[PDB]
Design a protein around this nucleic acid. Structure first.
Ligand SMILES: [Mg+2]
Ligand SMILES: [Mg+2]
Ligand SMILES: [Mg+2]
Ligand SMILES: [Mg+2]
Ligand SMILES: [Mg+2]
Ligand SMILES: [Mg+2]
Ligand SMILES: [Mg+2]
Length: 224
RNA sequence: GCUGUCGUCAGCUCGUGUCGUGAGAUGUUGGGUUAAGUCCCGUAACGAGCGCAACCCUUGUCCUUAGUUACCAGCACCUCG
């Protein structure tokens, strides 16, 4: 907010100068010490416009999926999905999570039934030779599928933190014609992102800044 | 219909999705591990099916039920079986 909060945490940084997508050239303020620098004066209006978009979309009882699976990122994405609701993914994105959603509905149902019978009084009362490995199966399933337990329909908008890390996901969205909100860095390509946010990745302070901005926007939009 | 053979070898496929103009590919590739496509970890693939394993018969130890035509530890007789 107000050109200073992001000025300190991590935003004005880029993946060196050897690696850089030329299509991002319009968002480069300059290069210092063989590191690309992003022009904040251009990304503030885009960030505010995206916040307005998300706030207005959250008024209308509709879902925005959060995608942030990466080092030290999927965690805070999880706790930001905590409160304000909304779906999320924090571990590996399974190919076909959108274009092949009918098949993954079955795994959703299997997880829901297994978790129902797991905490129904601990129905896993049989011998531990099978109980521990069934619990391991539950753990592995909830690890990569826990976020979209709810949200039975297709999400309306997708929010991704890193863009080239999540390219598969973006492609699926671009096939179903749903908007994409992304934090595009220097190396990534802004192609396939409807609301490009030229920010920074890998910076915990920066990424939590985006997550809290999004959380407050969606909370205000849903409040009415 | 029934049978041999590869071969009791660990393999052979399908649905949806994705890649290629197409035949096709992916799943089923990779690091380990196993008798085993057995299992774990990663992974544009997510699942399922037939195989593998388990369920079956027998043998190896123990308990309850029962002691005839089977048995004889203890008692009595014994022509000494
Ligand atoms: Mg095959
Ligand atoms: Mg097939
Ligand atoms: Mg197929
Ligand atoms: Mg095609
Ligand atoms: Mg093949
Ligand atoms: Mg292998
Ligand atoms: Mg098997």
């Amino acid at each position: 907010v107000n050109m200073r909060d992001m000025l300190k945490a991590g935003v004005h940084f880029g993946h060196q100068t050897r690696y850089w997508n030329p299509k991002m050239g319009k968002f480069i303020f300059g290069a210092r010490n063989k590191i690309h620098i992003i022009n904040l004066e251009k990304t503030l209006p885009m960030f505010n416009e995206a916040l307005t978009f998300v706030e207005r979309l959250a008024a209308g009882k509709n879902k925005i999926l959060f995608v942030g699976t990466k080092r030290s990122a999927g965690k805070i994405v999880r706790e930001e999905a905590a409160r304000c609701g909304m779906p999320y993914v924090d571990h590996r994105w399974l190919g076909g999570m959108l274009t092949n959603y009918k098949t993954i509905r079955q795994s959703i149902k299997r997880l829901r039934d297994l978790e129902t019978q797991s905490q129904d009084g601990t129905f896993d009362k049989l011998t531990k030779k099978e109980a521990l490995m069934r619990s391991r199966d539950l753990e592995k399933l909830e690890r990569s599928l826990g976020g979209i337990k709810d949200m039975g329909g297709l999400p309306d908008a997708l929010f991704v933190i890193d863009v080239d890390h999540e390219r598969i996901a973006i492609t699926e969205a671009n096939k179903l014609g749903i908007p994409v909100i992304g934090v595009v860095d220097t190396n990534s390509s802004p192609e396939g992102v409807d609301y490009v946010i030229p920010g920074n990745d890998d910076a915990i302070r920066a990424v939590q800044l985006y997550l809290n901005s999004m959380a407050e926007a969606v909370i205000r939009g849903k409040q009415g």
